[PDB]
Write a protein that binds this ligand. Sequence first.
Ligand SMILES: CC(C)=CCC/C(C)=C/CC/C(C)=C\CC/C(C)=C/CC/C(C)=C/CC/C(C)=C/CC/C(C)=C/CC/C(C)=C/CC/C(C)=C/CC1=C(C)C(=O)c2ccccc2C1=O
Ligand SMILES: CC(C)=CCC/C(C)=C\CC/C(C)=C\CC/C(C)=C/CC/C(C)=C/CC/C(C)=C\CC/C(C)=C/CC/C(C)=C\CC/C(C)=C/CC1=C(C)C(=O)c2ccccc2C1=O
Ligand code: HEC
Ligand code: HEC
Ligand code: HEM
Lengths: 55, 53, 107, 223, 110
Amino acid sequence: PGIILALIGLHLALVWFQKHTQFPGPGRTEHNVVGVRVMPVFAFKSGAFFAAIVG
Amino acid sequence: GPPFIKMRPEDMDAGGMETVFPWRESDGDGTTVESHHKLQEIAMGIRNPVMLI
Amino acid sequence: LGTLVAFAGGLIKNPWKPVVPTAEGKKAVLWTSGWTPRYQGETIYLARATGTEDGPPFIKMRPEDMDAGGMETVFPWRESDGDGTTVESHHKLQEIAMGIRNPVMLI
Amino acid sequence: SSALLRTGKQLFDTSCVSCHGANLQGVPDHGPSLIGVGEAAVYFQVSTGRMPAMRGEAQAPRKDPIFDEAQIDAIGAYVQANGGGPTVVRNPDGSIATQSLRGNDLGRGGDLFRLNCASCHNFTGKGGALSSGKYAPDLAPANEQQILTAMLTGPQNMPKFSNRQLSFEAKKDIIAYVKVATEARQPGGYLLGGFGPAPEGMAMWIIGMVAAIGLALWIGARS
Amino acid sequence: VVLLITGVYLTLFFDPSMVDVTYNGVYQPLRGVEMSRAYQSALDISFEVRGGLFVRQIHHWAALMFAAAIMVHLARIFFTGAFRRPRETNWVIGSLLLILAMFEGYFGYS
Ligand SMILES: CC(C)=CCC/C(C)=C/CC/C(C)=C\CC/C(C)=C/CC/C(C)=C/CC/C(C)=C/CC/C(C)=C/CC/C(C)=C/CC/C(C)=C/CC1=C(C)C(=O)c2ccccc2C1=O
Ligand SMILES: CC(C)=CCC/C(C)=C\CC/C(C)=C\CC/C(C)=C/CC/C(C)=C/CC/C(C)=C\CC/C(C)=C/CC/C(C)=C\CC/C(C)=C/CC1=C(C)C(=O)c2ccccc2C1=O
Ligand code: HEC
Ligand code: HEC
Ligand code: HEM
């Protein structure tokens, strides 16, 4: 569990600082990220998903 | 055979002390596993020991 | 190097050191079985398990206690082990019952 | 009226002689001799329905019985009159014992079952597969006398447990353990069949993962 | 996360020994049988702690879901091509995590 926790921390850090990938679409380029900000929306969706999985 | 043996009043002088435990002859000596369990539970009880003065 | 060797040196054991006493000296564990004689001519019975613990967990067998289509598991007895009354014989028997090379099929 | 096995040798002659012979001699093509066998073998083979059998192959399966109205007794007595095989247990009324064949110790019975019986059937008496066709059936619908006669007569490819290597108490205790293991609840929810992790993995993949992926499809947009 | 929480709960009742004892518990069809101390501790969790069977069942189901979700995530990463130039090392870390999860689940249910 300790090794797994360290590796998961490193994994999520690398994903956070190398921004996420995306699918080609209308306004998507290799130089921008199109989505929603964390602030109101993304934390909300993540927490609701957590609760549903626990359920 | 004996981890516990009975006592008589003459087995002590006027300046002696001794620790004693409850015997209950239905416990028997420590030969079988049943009597061995009974005796090992007698030996470990936090209110069993007694000083005889 | 010295530190790592001292760290990983308490775990290492030799699998071939003679520790098991037999009738030709002492052997390694991986070649003795419990069916191995100990003093050159001892009798080892084919005892069977009864599943009860009043006195017998193991009893001897006769050739007539089986028909032409039967199978039975047996264990080495060594009458010097006795029934499971005292703690000493109980330990001996519980070590007979758990040995990875002891069981045998009788056909 | 025990001096009447004229019935018995009225049904055998019209349902068995094509595969065992008129004198119970084992037609050298299909059937065994049936001389050393007794009433217990006939009872187990007919009451469970494995008898009179069609084509006959790696395993005769269990089917619906053909004979009752005390004619299983007729064939059993007729076959016992031609040999000395084991006999079916009886109660003080003359009927076949059901309740007297249940022991009172389930620990010893379960240990004996795990040592002798669980290898082919299961931990708790579900089925098990043998080589090249043959399998070991489920122990749920068999009653007590059928269990006793099964481990007493040693049917096809099942070993034969005499009354000298498995005494009568041992058999009664095994019967009691089997009948209790087939009739106890599952105190953890719906058991997925009695087997190990295969139904559990299937239920995971086909319930939990589809629920999770469906909620992921609902919450998140698709593009 | 759920695995961590339920395992921390479970560690308060488990005794990992291999010494032999006789059961003498509440489960009757096993009374008088000689068993190790770990098996007896697991039986005691199952039958003598209010809500222990529920917790160990949650633990096992969560382990299964952990493994399945890891495999589906790996399938996504592979098929969409999200392992290319900037992210090979993140792929490597994920592979190590997969191996460790497999062996951890094995050691757990043993
Ligand atoms: C995609 C990836 C595997 C490519 C790797 C690239 C490759 C070149 C690297 C080398 C790998 C080597 C050479 C060979 C790999 C083969 C094997 C030895 C690998 C070991 C572990 C491996 C890497 C794990 C990957 C397995 C794979 C990704 C599983 C994903 C399956 C898919 C995507 C699920 C989609 C949704 C799903 C189908 C919902 C429906 C449910 C169905 C029925 C799931 C089927 C199903 C499954 C999958 C069970 O595991 C299972 C287990 C026990 C009982 C039943 C089931 C069962 O029904
Ligand atoms: C301060 C205090 C502790 C001192 C104690 C004082 C002392 C005297 C008392 C002693 C008492 C001791 C013995 C015990 C105290 C504590 C004890 C009771 C704890 C034992 C276990 C206990 C029951 C645990 C309770 C806590 C529990 C209810 C809360 C759990 C909820 C938490 C852990 C959820 C966090 C989730 C996770 C770790 C955060 C990761 C960051 C988030 C999720 C972003 C992740 C994320 C990233 C990073 C992406 O890049 C990304 C990219 C694209 C899509 C998605 C994502 C995405 O989701
Ligand atoms: C040829 C078709 C066939 C018919 C019809 C048939 N049997 Fe059988 N019987 C067999 C075969 C084949 C076996 C071998 C057992 C096996 O392999 O399952 C057998 C086995 C038996 C056995 C057990 C033999 C043993 O050694 O344990 C008995 C008892 C028996 N039959 C009696 C009967 C009775 C009663 C009937 C109903 C009148 C009947 N048979 C009709 C083919 C048949
Ligand atoms: C894998 C070898 C094997 C062993 C060991 C074994 N069985 Fe069987 N058992 C079988 C086979 C094969 C059959 C099917 C015989 C038939 O259909 O004629 C069977 C049939 C039965 C049946 C009939 C099931 C029914 O629904 O009619 C019972 C009851 C039974 N066995 C009980 C036991 C008991 C009790 C033991 C332990 C003493 C045991 N078996 C050990 C293989 C075995
Ligand atoms: C991280 C991945 C983990 C996996 C995949 C995993 C998996 C498992 C599984 C499948 C079991 C079997 C449970 C049962 O059958 O009843 C188990 C048992 C157990 N786990 Fe975990 N586990 C994990 C983490 C942990 C952690 C972090 C802890 C403690 C901090 C823990 C503590 C325990 C304990 C004590 C048991 C034995 C208790 C019992 O069997 O009832 N586990 N594990």
